[PDB]
């Protein structure tokens, strides 16, 4: 009854049109494989966009926003069809409706639209969504509405190329600072993932995040009770420490390395490998930061992972050790060899990964000095010539 639904929706009997719209909403909001493409072919999009403008019928507006939300949850082509119907400006206008349902459903639909891609994101931004979106941030807001708002913020921050506008980043960061102090685990996870995406953009974005003054709230969450929060915060601080040594030191000043023994001993190898990646980026910094890592007593755990851990964690630990050997003083390399690192650092030489093999060979060669691929054989020969001969 799709075309009968469409025709009845194109009616001026409020009852008939609302019944048809809620029937289409039912069709599109149940079966795992909905009839989005067929209902688009039947021409329901312009009718629903028209219904969005009917301020005199709030429930019709709400049901139309619902149907369009679920239509935009399908393929990129279907989301782009919704966008082509001229639904985004009407959603933007309904954000300021006196009824909260149309407003929340418009936030939902605009989030689905923004999440499609960076071009739709930039269009919705140009139309000015950020200010009314963050105006809803208030203590009296229901946690459901606030969760949807935070999800929309994550979607706004998600895409990398092109990155979100600097002014939108500047507007969003203060709201993230307000929300980082929320109890709701979903809100906190969304906030941390959003600022993680922001810190994955570039060094100037990392510097803006550092200027906001939220890193000292981010670091404690490394030991949060929730593994989702922990993983998001781990990736965020990892991104931040991929930048300059100044920013890395700002991260380290919040007593971050205190949270890493539990992460290194965690039962989840993904947590293990991300923690080892963070520590590798730390070992690729100043000798003072290498000394800090050594003082936190994380090096023996890094070596144990290099010895008996998952192969990805082993690769990351090889990276960390090699970065320490090239960027460490003779006393620190001496400590490394005292902690029995040579056997496990050598056993990896047999793996296929040319990158990790070359990293191991370089670490070994630099250690000795401190005491297929051309790059590999050349190092093998240079090391053998200087130390074997």
């Amino acid at each position: 009854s799709l075309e009968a639904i469409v025709q009845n929706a194109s009616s001026d009997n409020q009852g008939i049109q609302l019944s048809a719209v809620q029937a289409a909403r039912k069709l599109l909001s149940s079966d795992r494989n909905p009839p989005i493409d067929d209902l688009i072919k039947s021409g329901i999009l312009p009718i629903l966009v028209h219904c969005l403008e009917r301020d005199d019928n709030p429930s019709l507006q709400f049901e139309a926003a619902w149907a369009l939300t679920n239509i935009a949850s399908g393929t990129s082509e279907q989301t782009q069809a919704v966008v082509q119907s001229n639904a985004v400006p009407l959603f933007l206008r309904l954000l300021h409706s006196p009824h909260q349902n149309v407003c929340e459903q418009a936030v939902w639909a605009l989030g689905n639209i923004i999440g499609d891609g960076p071009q739709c994101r930039d269009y919705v931004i140009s139309l000015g969504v950020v200010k009314p979106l963050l105006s809803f941030i208030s203590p009296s807001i229901p946690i459901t509405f606030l969760r949807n708002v935070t999800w929309v913020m994550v979607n706004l921050c998600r895409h990398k190329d092109p990155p979100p506008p600097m002014e939108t980043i500047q507007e969003i960061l203060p709201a993230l600072c307000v929300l980082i102090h929320h109890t709701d685990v979903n809100i906190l996870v969304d906030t941390v993932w959003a600022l993680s995406y922001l810190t994955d953009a570039g060094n100037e974005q990392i510097q803006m995040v550092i200027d906001s003054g939220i890193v000292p709230h981010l670091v404690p969450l490394l030991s949060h009770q929730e593994v989702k929060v922990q993983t998001a915060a781990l990736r965020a601080v990892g991104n931040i420490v991929t930048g300059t040594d100044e920013q890395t030191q700002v991260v380290l000043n919040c007593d971050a390395l205190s949270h890493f023994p539990a992460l290194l001993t965690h039962p989840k190898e993904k947590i293990n490998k991300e923690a080892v990646w963070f520590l590798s980026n730390i070992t690729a910094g100043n000798q003072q930061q290498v000394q800090a890592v050594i003082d936190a007593n994380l090096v023996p755990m890094i070596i144990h992972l290099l010895d008996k851990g998952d192969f990805g964690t082993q690769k990351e630990a090889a990276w960390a050790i090699s970065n320490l050997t090239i960027s460490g003083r003779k006393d620190q390399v001496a400590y490394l060899i005292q902690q029995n690192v040579i056997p496990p650092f050598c056993n990896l030489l047999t793996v296929k990964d040319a990158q990790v093999v070359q990293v191991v060979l370089d670490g070994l060669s630099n250690i000795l000095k401190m005491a297929e691929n051309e790059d590999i054989y050349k190092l093998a020969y240079e090391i053998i010539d200087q130390f074997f001969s």
Binding site: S29, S30, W66, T69, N70, A72, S73, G74, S76, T79, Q105, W108, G111, N112, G115, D116, G117, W151, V154, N155, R158, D200, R235, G238, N239, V241, T242, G243, W277, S280, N281, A284, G285, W319, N323
Partner: peptide, 15 residues
């Protein structure tokens, strides 16, 4: 030197 994370549509339906 410093290394970055390896490269890895979030839409939600209302039921």
């Amino acid at each position: 030197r410093k290394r970055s994370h390896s490269p890895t549509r979030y839409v939600k339906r209302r039921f």
